Design an enzyme around this catalytic site. Structure first.
Site, PDB file in Angstrom:
ATOM      1  N   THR A 205       0.815  -2.443   1.035  1.00 25.92           N
ATOM      2  CA  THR A 205      -0.049  -1.253   0.880  1.00 25.92           C
ATOM      3  C   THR A 205       0.551  -0.419  -0.045  1.00 25.92           C
ATOM      4  O   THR A 205       1.299   0.611   0.434  1.00 25.92           O
ATOM      5  CB  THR A 205       0.168  -0.713   2.618  1.00 25.92           C
ATOM      6  OG1 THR A 205      -0.232  -1.641   3.698  1.00 25.92           O
ATOM      7  CG2 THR A 205      -1.081   0.423   2.943  1.00 25.92           C
ATOM      8  N   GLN A 206      -0.292  -0.352  -1.067  1.00 25.51           N
ATOM      9  CA  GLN A 206       0.371   0.668  -2.143  1.00 25.51           C
ATOM     10  C   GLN A 206      -0.672   1.005  -3.298  1.00 25.51           C
ATOM     11  O   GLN A 206      -2.036   0.912  -2.896  1.00 25.51           O
ATOM     12  CB  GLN A 206       1.478  -0.278  -3.047  1.00 25.51           C
ATOM     13  CG  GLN A 206       1.214  -1.512  -3.300  1.00 25.51           C
ATOM     14  CD  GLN A 206       2.320  -2.248  -4.336  1.00 25.51           C
ATOM     15  OE1 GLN A 206       3.083  -3.141  -3.694  1.00 25.51           O
ATOM     16  NE2 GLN A 206       2.406  -1.701  -5.533  1.00 25.51           N
TER      17      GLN A 206
ATOM     18  N   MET B 252       0.066  -8.019   2.853  1.00 24.19           N
ATOM     19  CA  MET B 252      -0.548  -6.734   2.693  1.00 24.19           C
ATOM     20  C   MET B 252       0.139  -5.928   1.737  1.00 24.19           C
ATOM     21  O   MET B 252       0.502  -4.694   1.936  1.00 24.19           O
ATOM     22  CB  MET B 252      -0.781  -6.124   4.061  1.00 24.19           C
ATOM     23  CG  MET B 252      -1.972  -6.829   4.925  1.00 24.19           C
ATOM     24  SD  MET B 252      -3.341  -6.945   3.913  1.00 24.19           S
ATOM     25  CE  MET B 252      -3.988  -5.396   4.167  1.00 24.19           C
ATOM     26  N   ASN B 253       1.049  -6.483   0.894  1.00 26.57           N
ATOM     27  CA  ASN B 253       1.834  -5.607   0.073  1.00 26.57           C
ATOM     28  C   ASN B 253       1.905  -6.493  -1.411  1.00 26.57           C
ATOM     29  O   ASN B 253       2.591  -7.350  -1.766  1.00 26.57           O
ATOM     30  CB  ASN B 253       3.238  -5.747   0.460  1.00 26.57           C
ATOM     31  CG  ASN B 253       4.218  -4.966  -0.306  1.00 26.57           C
ATOM     32  OD1 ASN B 253       5.684  -5.191  -0.324  1.00 26.57           O
ATOM     33  ND2 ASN B 253       3.757  -4.229  -1.315  1.00 26.57           N
TER      34      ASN B 253
END
Lengths: 233, 122
Positions: A1-2, A107-108
């Site tokens: 998440t970035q 999710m990264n």
């Protein structure tokens, strides 16, 4: 998440009769500020592969470290590290494509779009793309970001299908790549005039050209443009 | 009494750790290997025994590299040496990842020393 911070724009490439060529400018933008002008986004792996990376620069720097490690670790207990059991473009690609997809599934993601250009040990050209989502594809020409929109149409006029590859010379290919890079400096607000280009040929090997500059630009016609409609002077 | 030599970390009445000393004996029953430091480098050499003509010549390499600038050769139980090198490799990588520069030789030595010494504590 970035979210990406320092970024690199297009990476363009195309395959020709005896190799592949790949290029990418030397900029690292911070939003609309063209912050860093000496960033190399083309990463040679050994003497038969060049990985071009666009997207987040801190993540590209991470992928660089990973590639240097792959080389160190492949030499280990490998008497044939500089020969039969050297890293092939297909190995470097599959490895990266694996990492990219794993990172997206956690999710990264590594916020990048990557093109691995190279020549296999039996002479085959290798050109394949992988991005932050683990999506991968191959084509006679491949470009990321903005270049997918403006460079591909141009490079494709040279190599429209597989049969066109054997009819294309390094001279022709390099000319097209260089022109695309000029078009991108014209129309991409996040481009730099300074770029790097690499050719991976099955005979002459890896030729890596640094500090290239877009030249032969047409700007003279601007003298005759005045106003935005009715202004006469 | 006796028995001070059946378990590793145990100190004998004279302060020796018999299991370590028996390890040394396994070393003395092995091939000779050497190292010579020179004016700007080091050279490693090892004797490899030819148990029979069936051994493919020049294939069972014994000397090993760590990172790109360290050479390691050992005598004794070959597998234990490999184990030791595997750790050295993890140790050298760890150092490079955090500090960028490849691992200094004195630092690498201690990394190996501490791991080996760790195996004399339990």
């Amino acid at each position: 998440t970035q979210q990406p911070i320092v970024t690199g724009t297009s990476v363009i490439s195309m395959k020709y009769d005896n190799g592949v060529i790949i290029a990418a400018d030397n900029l690292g933008s911070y939003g609309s500020l063209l912050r860093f002008n000496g960033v190399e986004r083309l990463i040679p792996v050994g003497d038969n592969t060049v990985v071009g990376i666009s997207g987040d620069i801190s993540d590209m720097q991470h992928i660089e470290r990973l590639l240097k490690d792959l080389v160190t670790e492949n030499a280990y207990d490998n008497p044939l590290a500089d020969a039969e059991e050297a890293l092939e473009p297909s190995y470097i690609f599959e490895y990266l494509a694996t990492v990219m997809y794993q990172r997206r599934s956690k999710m990264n993601p590594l916020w990048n779009a990557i093109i691995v250009a190279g020549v296999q040990s039996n002479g085959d050209q290798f050109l394949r793309y992988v991005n932050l989502l683990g999506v991968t594809y191959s084509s006679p020409t491949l470009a990321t970001g903005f270049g997918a929109h403006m460079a591909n149409p141009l490079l494709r006029k040279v190599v429209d299908r597989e049969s066109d590859i054997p009819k294309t010379t390094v001279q022709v290919a390099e000319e097209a790549i260089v022109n695309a890079m000029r078009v991108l400096y014209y129309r991409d607000a996040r481009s730099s005039r300074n770029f790097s280009l690499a050719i991976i040929d099955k005979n002459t090997g890896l030729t890596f050209k640094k500090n290239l500059q877009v030249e032969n630009m047409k700007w003279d016609f601007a003298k005759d443009i005045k106003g935005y409609g009715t202004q006469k002077i | 009494g006796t028995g001070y030599d059946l378990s590793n970390s145990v100190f004998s009445p004279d302060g020796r750790n018999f299991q370590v000393e028996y390890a040394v004996k396994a070393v003395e029953n092995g091939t000779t290997s050497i190292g010579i430091k020179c004016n700007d480098g080091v050279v490693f050499a090892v004797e490899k025994l030819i148990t029979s003509k069936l051994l493919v010549p020049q294939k069972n390499v014994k000397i090993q590299v760590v990172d790109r600038h360290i050479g390691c050769v050992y005598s004794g139980l070959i597998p234990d040496g490999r184990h030791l090198v595997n750790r050295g490799r993890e140790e050298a990588a760890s150092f490079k990842k955090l500090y960028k520069t490849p691992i200094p030789i004195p630092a690498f030595a201690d990394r190996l020393g501490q791991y080996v010494q760790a195996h004399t504590l339990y």
